[model samples]
Target: REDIAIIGISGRYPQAENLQEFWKNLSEGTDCITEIPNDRWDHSLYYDADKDKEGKTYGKWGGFLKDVDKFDPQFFSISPRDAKLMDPQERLFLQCVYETMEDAGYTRKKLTEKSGDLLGANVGVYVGVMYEEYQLYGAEEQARTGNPSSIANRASYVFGFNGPSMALDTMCSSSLTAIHLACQSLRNGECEAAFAGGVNVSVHPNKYLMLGQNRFLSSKGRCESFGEGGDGYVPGEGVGAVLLKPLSKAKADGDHIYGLIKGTAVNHDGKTNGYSVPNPNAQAAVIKQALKDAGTDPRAVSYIEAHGTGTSLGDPIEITGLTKAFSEQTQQFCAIGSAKSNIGHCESAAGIAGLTKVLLQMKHKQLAPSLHSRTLNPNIDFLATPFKVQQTLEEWKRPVINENLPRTAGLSSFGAGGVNAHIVIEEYSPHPSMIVLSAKNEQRLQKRAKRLLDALRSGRYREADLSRIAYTLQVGREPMEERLGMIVSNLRELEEKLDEFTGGKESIDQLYRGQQNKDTMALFTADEDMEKTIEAWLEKGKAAKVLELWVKGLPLNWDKLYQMGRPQKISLPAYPFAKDRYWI
Candidate 1:
């Protein structure tokens, strides 16, 4: 397979605030599960110590994201009245997509700057989401905004994404399936670029009641993926997204290459032993088909981001299937793990969450430990199989497969009702890049600077390529009225300048500020160097004229001015929104 690049990524996970922090928790094997929060519902009302209790759940623990009620819909141009009616899940998705675009350095103008804007129209949006109970019995102010279809449509409406816009629900495999369909779309020429992701929110304990009645709810309130004491998976909520581009376009466009989707396949468990029973044969087939599609052999793949949901029944089935799949061709020592152990099962968002984990690990070149799984499930024979449970924080070495290629891994996601999906992934090299920043005002500008400064200082993005961080700020950022542009040769310089400017104590000698108005673009500097910079830019031809226009105060796509070199985008916080209570 020629493959598609997994460029930009963002997510909100349990305990962890962002993708960087999420990786840290995973690497350190942190237990993020906790008691249910009061904001979602009254946990005590449904709590029961007995597993057989009527109309109750024995478990009180889960992986919950904080501040699900909060959203700055104003940031998306939605009126407060209408925003209040939209589901928080949809609101969260919009924010994730916004961050995803910035991560790609494809600001609105830059996204379509080529092809006279038709390419922007060629961009697609696909989201996996379900369980919309926000407008159910005795609920308030529900309308079109709360609809499931609107989940994908809302992003299109905001960004003018013109290709296929759809929302899918394949239960637990929804997020992964969304990715599969997106890869299919890109391959079929249905779209040039795709935004695929999933969002799940256990908004009510009614879901708990649903799981408890079937004995699916973890009585222990946690999932012990591949562990001996595993009971069931704890419920989880989260939002995650990624932007996909064909490899050639991604490289030519210079997107931050986190990982590559070599191949992906989605299938259903046909005629299983029971309706809800996970079929090991189907799981094995899906992985085999995905490897075949990517032209990768089982022995070539080392690490697997397994769909280890920590269920006594399902974990055995998953491992048995993986064992069978890899055993058919090679007995190479393959390491396996899951994100559910860290963030529980995000249901609809599960696939992207796991995929995001693989990308983070691929970028870091380290396999994060699978938590709560010190011992193996006795049902599966580890010695007889070709897989090993990666239960420690181990640095990843390139596999022996061909040794000439980058590292390779596979990720699997299976939904309830028998849908299973798997994707073949490979890491990519990042090129030197530039970044751009803009704001509505000086105050807002500094706020964004401070946010980025905090991220850099926190060591949150340790795996990121410094040049790509600089590149994303330039090409993928929207040009604002009050803006500042800088050419950062390294990440440290970017952080230092932001730090000094944030202090408001002195000027950053490397960067200059400018404002855009209707008539002219105004550069604030009153030095002869300014004139030289403007005409020097004009000499670069048509694209360079925008640089000249930029000096006179006209808003310009700074990324469009560059005619040479490739650049990539990196993850950065979104614009700081001044939010208020918009609830009806």
Candidate 2:
């Protein structure tokens, strides 16, 4: 593994508002589970505890977060109106990432510059089983206007990261798989660092309805990890993030180290288990392989973060795999626990949540208690007890000075499609050096600028695929006519402002004014080909002039408007003059 460090970590949980509170709650064995609030679990549809006598209501229990209306858009430098339209999961994700960067002693500017060209973002977004308020709002607007891209692309564009941004939905294992992909990219040197995590916003009617049909929710009560009375698992929602740098570079930079990721392995149950059922053999194999890749003996591990989704069969099957993989060592030193006991199953964010808990434990030097585990399950027990619930607050004993220090930890995630992954992580440290941009680099940038301009001028309408572009615009549901009008209006205003600033003498200003007029005419004319061609030319000319100005260090006049700013208002729906209604 490269010397990458866990420089920053942040998350939001059910009972705990932030990472610190989450840790505190975990350490204290506080039960975050309770009856689903009326706001989320509407009493009319499913099993409502308040009204049902047989206790058969579908909306009785959950580990729902309390602060549904709290959000700070200005903190992330976004408009409150826009934030309101976005999924709460996305908002939480942005908050966590911001906090993580701050914890790493890095500002947005520093991180952007450091990761600029080599930047990448991978998000593990759980399939929203039920559409939340934001989704419903967006969907309504989309139906009226017929556009849906704003749902995911807004985040990617706002963050300004170019490498492989995607929303993964592999059920429960989504976030863990995302983390795996991030590590692979770093190891392969495809990126310098990456932002990887998961998010979920509890929506309405649908999620509860589906869970009821599947009997997945805990009807008997809250989650009890490996306990005798446990009946089913509770659903949860939240968000989390981790900043990953190459191991070698992280250590070289003397970054704040949480722990290291030694190795990762993933596999699916092939043809044997029920479609949605757990496969012990496959799960055990993944764990074994991860440990082997980490080059550490299983007997040396001190703890295991079990994916204990308290169900009639899930816990025993998970324990069965753990026992098979660890053998005698399962009884020796390794203490086991499940985060589901505290936060329920956070769906896509569950893996990151668990990893965050482990990191905090290692940092604060204390093991968190596994709440609600009164009696151990009798299904299988190779040892006196499969896990020790840290009932009281106690400081973690630091690993012995020279006992290999066992700087590794394991994480497991399994999705509904039989996707299973196990990862081993170790602490990271780095050496330091300055990052610099040179003349040659500048020249390369200029060439890229020119290429971009050329592409713009090519009248390549196909390149502006509507399905692809829609994602970018889906964040706001305003009608296409209104949205386009606003953008053009803003650009026109900007040009006029610049003209006034230059007192009408700047050639660049005049050129910009002319270009804006041409765009507006072409868009309004209903001539698609002409509009696209004109757009391309305008973009190319602007880009070329901007680069030339950068190289020559001279004031760019209207004749070279690109020197002023990159192209704006290039969206498909905004090109009103185009005859073809088709987006691409």
Candidate 3:
């Protein structure tokens, strides 16, 4: 019951606008780093080969998000001028958190209580961030727009969240630390649910020079991650977050769970060699603590997503820290990797980036190739440790335990200032998936159906995912003015029906579509005979009429409908935002 489940996830990363595209890039081992674009700043003005060149950054490239200037301000009820004044981090964070709620089948209206007045859910908002570059330009109203604290508070205000809300910055470990704190909040009953993650946007160049002063910026422009020729870490930008709730509550609520967080711990390296240097002893202690908190054996965890920032000095320290944490283990029983190897170090967002990678791998049951490590770093003796760098894509199989146990993994993220966080996650062994589509308008509605059609056509989803798709669509999404509902029993049939809908054939049998009509609902409520007939139809397991009525704007009591052995909610495509540019 103490375990927390990841009920929702959403993010935008370099070369990938969404988690699916992010997974595609990872599985294909694509390097997502690119040279600094001129729009950010003229690289030539700051670039220099000499690391000691004052005010210049030797680093030429880093992982950057696409369209940081783009957002749908009107959708969030923010004025265009305020949106322009707002930090891009806050803009992206708001969108991602809202999407997280939608992915979890929640809306502001749904989360609110029905006690005559609108009382919102006790959902805490905890966000991590480390930069304030977006505010350097102007001072007027920037306090509200540019303050890092608003990153978390604005989300709470916009989403009607009534629980604790705050932004934290522990440099690189901020995000995972946020997750750890969120788990504690859930366990201690501070909130029924929470949104925890981090965001980073590279809008200023002085940050590069500041990092380069400490020789932290990678001269090589890529995170080599446990590989030879590691020179440091490149700065990356993105925003990612997850929705979490107690495992028992999540399962009881029939929520879609991507995975479970068995345990999480955060600590600092007190009095390290330097104020910014990492302490291996503290790292080891945090990993051990999290495992103890999880009640899991060291050998049970088969994968470790290390804080591999591709620094020659940091890689060996991190590896040996794990070695000490798993004390007395002689065999290389666990595979280690880093998302930083592919996406570069996201700094404050890095922890969520790594955690999201592990979740995606758990869902697909495949280890994504950790990139750029052609030759192992000679500083660490891999042959002597109980770990191996995961160099290629491979099946993520369960351990051969005497009792049935799910696949488990650990993730580590260490901040530059000695804050370290570790989390243990396990694949919840269980699901058919369901599909649902709704939009504010007819065109948006059909556009979503077309997107779902494309997803089904991808051949990535399997037969086992069919029912969950239907269930999610049935209960997870908020019914909109324009709605489409169907009971697809298999992937093939689902694809066929969606194809028809997207291809302008909405008259198919069992596929319901219509404009919501609240006036029609009065007929059922006012006429007992009609209500009794509908109940009889439901009792006979004939839901065609109910579904049709629902599509036509009658509210549904999904809990009463699926009162017995309800299907589990699963993650599916979220509401597609009609994004446009809102830049300064």
Candidate 4:
């Protein structure tokens, strides 16, 4: 019951709009590093290879998120003018939050009206956001609203979530640190569910200039993580978030679990040679604590998502700490890698990016060699340790030594100021799946349906439990007004039904339509036809109660429908934005 489950995840990364593309890019070992986009500052103006130079950077390339300035305010029902006041970080966070929640099938607006530290199915928002670069250079309104402090609250306010809505900035380790807090809250009974993640955007180059001048960025404009040529990390920009709940509740509520967060630990270095100095001892302590917390042995872990920042000393220090944590657990080799080598270091968002990569790998059961580390770091003696940098995509075969153990991995995120986080992740075999989908209007219905169909037909989904897919969509998803109800037993039927509906064959028996009047709630509660319809739904047994209560504006015991059934969530195409550029 104490274990946390990642029910949903969403984000955009360099050259990838969704997590799928991101994984494909990473598993393929494709470094998306390129010259700074023209939309951002001109690289020539800041490019200065001389580390001694001030107010300029040697970094001409970065891992960048596309269309940071473009957004569809209408989708959020936000006015165009006011939307400009929000930072791209805030804007993107909201979009990604909705997508994440929708991915969790909780996108339908539920009443969370309450006040206090917590109440009801407490949904907390803990965001790891360090760079609010937008505020450094925006209109007056932007400065007021674009600050990182408001980032988490913005989602909480709009979503009407009433848990501990706050932001965290632990430097590079912020996001995963935020996850630590969210999971703690859930275990402590402070929140029933949580949104935990981070965001980073390169709206300006001034900070990059500082990092560059401070000798933190690669001079060659690439991240050579754990490599002999390692110098510095190329900063990247993106927003990523994950939905979490206690494993008991997640399964009880029939959440599509990505994997189990067995244990997590957070610590800060008391003092070091310097504030930025990498401390292997402190890093090791946190990892050891996490393993202890999970009752897991270091030898059981098969892979490690390292904080491979590509810095000369950072890589060695991180790996050294990793070995220390696993000290005496067996010198058996464990696969090591970094998302930073592929997407570059994402600063505040870096931790979650690495965690996401591990989750994707755990779900897919494959591990690709750490990118840009074709050459090992000369400073570290790798063969002497229990770690090896993986190079090609390899099947995640169960470790023969720990054949009875679950597929396990370690995720590390070390921020400056000595704050460090270590999380243990375990792969969960998925059950049969189901997916229930709804849209506010007819157009959106097709838009939503087509994506799942495409994803299924393409066979790209990490979630392979087909029956659970429909089950997730059925009870896991929130319904909308226009397209009333539809049922399908399998992915093929789902595909056929979607294809038929999209092709204008509306007389299908599987779907039912209902129109709403202004006094919709009144009519809904009074409807005579609702009885027979509900009678049929009652056949679903207790699961039938969710829809009836939902329609009547009553709170639902979401986990009750399935008696906390074991279900694994599958990803689908996110909302199709009818976006127009919104810039101030």
Candidate 5:
């Protein structure tokens, strides 16, 4: 057994509410794309320069998140005004971190030692961060200047995680590369635990304009990957995250295991076929290296989460790479699928979303189906020969229990600029006795659980109190059901608040579109009942449930909310010719 394990996972994606829902959608072969409804694009004015055709924009289809306003700044210790300026990607990353930590049964206290020294965290937060100006302007406007290190620095400081942190911008491979780094760090004993993932927000108007101008986006009505009518990829937005613990430590502690990071490798398309296109050989080399490093045969991989961008050149190159890497094993048991078909292209965040889908599938022992491809593209002959395109939900088959059930799967990510990365992960299974609770401490645990519930209901979720809760639960001194009940109760409160917001005078869509003023948006977003409940538990002495609810429900328009808000300003400095700029 390895020393590291994936104890917790969390993510948010287009259409898919959570990782569990995302997995179901994938298995059911759901396609999340629809008409791109953002008012920013004037479809009537759009013309296909290549075909010299004019009408409604042909590629007016995409996958967009309808619930970004679900995030609240107060829960993250961020001011509303600041949250407005931070990239949606950054906000999502913070949310994922909190969610993952909570899922891992860790509280704020456990994360920070008594002397305020961090226990240690290995956080590889790489964002295929596309829009810096918009994401950084809040801090810049506040300080009357910008600092380049602001984004990553703010994230590290806010999370209180003392570990290696970086913001990578390797086009499409950013997240997978981040995962690779995190896995390697765990193997090298750089940290006791880690968080790895990526994020992207697609609200930037200029990004679409540039993509349209450069013909990077699909100009056809649909983006059909590995299909006869394959066009180009569509733009998208999403965020994802995964928590890692040393495998040996996890097994020793009976920690929940999602999967194992067997091996990972990255390389550039050295002396490639073209400047902005993929090189099959480089892609093949990375896969081979990953398999070799994992000490696993290529034939052992049951599935491949491919970098299927729904583009003409990209799909064929990826197909060639797979064939070359797998060789005769290509005809073995491996199957291929693409999440891009449903969510369009989430840019830097895409790799994480894809990996999340694959991990969930491995967990459930089911395969997700790809969409948009009908007739296989002749250019990618592998799809027709060795590899088959997963079509309908019917084709999804549960792995045979006795057939070695492919403990490992391969994930491939290739950037437009020659950066190539491959990763292999093993499925994780929990040992039975790890979560058992003892009888002697049952009464004390019950009392503590009651206290925790009372605190949450009253709105006092302090760091110290949560830490105690986590510590007690970790030792198996508390009833697992009671702990779960507390979490569920808090979640229920949050759902109630969401219900109120969605059923209010304004529509959920309008709230998400920021149709109201900034202050109103903040109030609406921060009115998370679940958070209030947690706070109540943490601050039991000062908790007042009725008062908090009243305050949250107080009707205030955008102007009034803005007047009452004054937050410290930070600066985000700019760097010359950032890598993401070249991608645009």
Candidate 6:
């Protein structure tokens, strides 16, 4: 399998608004599930312990994301009416996709062909979406935007992506399946890059009712994965997305590499004991195939993000399958865990949830605790299997296998109806250019500056990272109506300059700010003499001179200035969107 690099990742998850908060919750072993919020539905009305209840759900808790009703329609240049008719899943996916694009350093100019043929034609979009609860709002207009297919198409339409765009559903394996297809698309040259992930919204009560009556949801309202209290999965909602590029191209483009996907495999249980019942043989087969596809030895994998939904049927079957897959290995050297134990089962978005958790773990070099799994499930033979439940937070050191291999892990997702997916990823071990900052308004621009300042001061970035940060801003972001540009030699200087601007101090040398007025742009474009002089300054390696003009609404070729040293793009703080409520 050709390697695919996860260049950009973004998501909004249960009890966490962004990736940082999400990681904090996971690393700290915080329980993110909560009693069903009143905004979604009245819990009392649906509370019933009887699984046979016709209209009530036994569960009273779930992993719910905040402000699913909020969106910034104006930022996406979408009409308020059109946005209102859209599912919250669509709205959230839009923001996540936009943030991913920004994180990947894919500017509007970069998304288009050099010949100005079509925008995003080389980009494909594959979003996993199954639930379409927004249509329950009873608006006939919802038909256009509430369909699951629109989830992928809308993003393509908004971003002008002409590549294959489609939403897929393999139930719980949706997101991972989407990523699999996206990877195959890239390998087949269907597109140069792709946006792949999934979104799940727990919007309507009927969904819970349906799952509850079917005994698929946990009455205890917790995903006690691999624990003695194994029952059923707790419902969760999330939007997870990522921008992916072929590993060689990503390296050539100097894109930030979060993690590298070595291989991915999806399969079905085909005529199992039951349709929704998972087949241990099939699960083991998929794991084996994925490991083979990845060219990875079973002993080299240190962690397994299992599809443990706390169900007695699922937990043991998953372990049995994993044990079978590693038949040649002995001893419980591999640590297994599930993010569902913390955030509940996200259904369609569950696969991305686990994938992102693994990516974050790889990034931080730490394994987050799998909550409520301290008391092992009695049905599973943990002592005899080649696995152990990771019940506590611990340092995830890379294993020494002759030559030290990168921290490698496998993530599994089994859809309720037998579809299974597995992906192998390894830790990626990897300069500064003009940091460009922009926003639709002054406030957002200032907020972006503050975020950058905080990010730099957090001690996460080193002095060597300043160039890539600058480069990302200059060439990776689209110039907005309001813009700020800076040139500094080191992180400390850049932080101080950003601090001054964010603190409301007047712009000074080294820090420039301007509004992108059309009149100024038109006048500047008409001035051939000034343009030639700017070109001469650029030719003379005078970035400061060109930067000053850029602040005054001059549209300079930012890429040309970086020809001397092609600074690589790095991930930075995403655009801070305005929080405005838009609901039916």
**Per-prediction TM-score, please?**
0.88, 0.66, 0.90, 0.86, 0.69, 0.93
Q: Could you tell me which 10 consecutive residues in candidate 5 have the lowest summed lDDT?
A: 570-579
Note the residue pairs that clash in candidate 6. 431-467, 431-468, 432-467, 432-468, 433-467, 433-470, 433-471, 434-470, 435-470, 436-473
Tens digit of lDDT per residue, candidate 5, span 1-584? 25357766777777876665677677777777766665534545554455343332335656677655444555456665665445545656776766666555554544543234445343544334555445334443553223323545556678676767777778888888878877777777766666787877665455555566556776664557677877777877777778786767665544556777888889999886568888888888898888877888776777788888777788887888888887745445567888887677878777788888777776666777778777888776554455667776543353455644546678888898778998887775510111111112223332333333444555534332332333334331212221111121233443343333334434432121111134544644567774565445444433233223222232211111122332211111100110111111
Error of 1 at 483 (Å): 2.9
Which lDDT tens digits does candidate 1 get at residues 103-178? 6657876455656755456788889998776765355543443478888888888888778888998978898988
- Model 4 local distance difference test score: 0.74
The residue-by-residue lDDT of candidate 3 on 71-95, one tens digit each, is 7776666887777566788878998
By TM-score, the better pick of 1 and 3 is 3
Which ranking of candidates, highest lDDT first?
A: 6, 3, 1, 4, 5, 2
Best by lDDT: 6
lDDT of 1: 0.77
lDDT of 4 by residue, 462-543 (tens): 3345555555555546555544444433445556666776688568455544434455566545767865555555455543
* TM-score, predicted candidate 2 vs. hidden true structure: 0.66
The clash count of every prediction, one per candidate, is 17, 39, 12, 23, 29, 10
**Runs off by more than 4 Å, candidate 2:** 1-3, 41-57, 74-81, 111-153, 328-331, 383-394, 398-404, 427-584
**How displaced is residue 528 in candidate 6, in Å?**
7.9
Per-residue error (Å), model 6, residue 414:
0.4
| lDDT over C-alpha atoms for residue 260 of model 1 | 88
Q: What is each predicted model's overall lDDT from 0 to 1? A: 0.77, 0.57, 0.80, 0.74, 0.60, 0.81
Off by over 4 Å in 5: 1-3, 38-59, 112-128, 133-151, 328-331, 383-385, 394-405, 430-584
**Segments of candidate 6 deviating more than 4 angstroms:** 113-119, 139-145, 328-332, 430-433, 505-511, 516-532, 539-545
**Residue 364 local lDDT, model 3:** 87
What tens digits encode model 6's per-residue C-alpha lDDT throughout 1-584?
47899999999889987788899999999999887777877666746866555677676778887768998998878988776666788878988999999888788666664336554556788988886886677565544444788778878888777788888989898999998999889887768888999999888887887888788866677889888877777888888999898887777767788998888899999788776798888898898989887998888889999888778888898888888899854442889988888897888888899998998898788999889977887777764667888879999887785753678899999988778999988877812245667788867877888887787777777886666677677778888778777766664677778778767767567677776357776666677786777667766664566666676677776565655668787778899888888776
Better of 1 and 2 by TM-score: 1
- Tens digits of per-residue lDDT, candidate 2, 323-420, equal 78877354435667778788878877778888888888887677787777767777847455444544445665534546436545677778766888
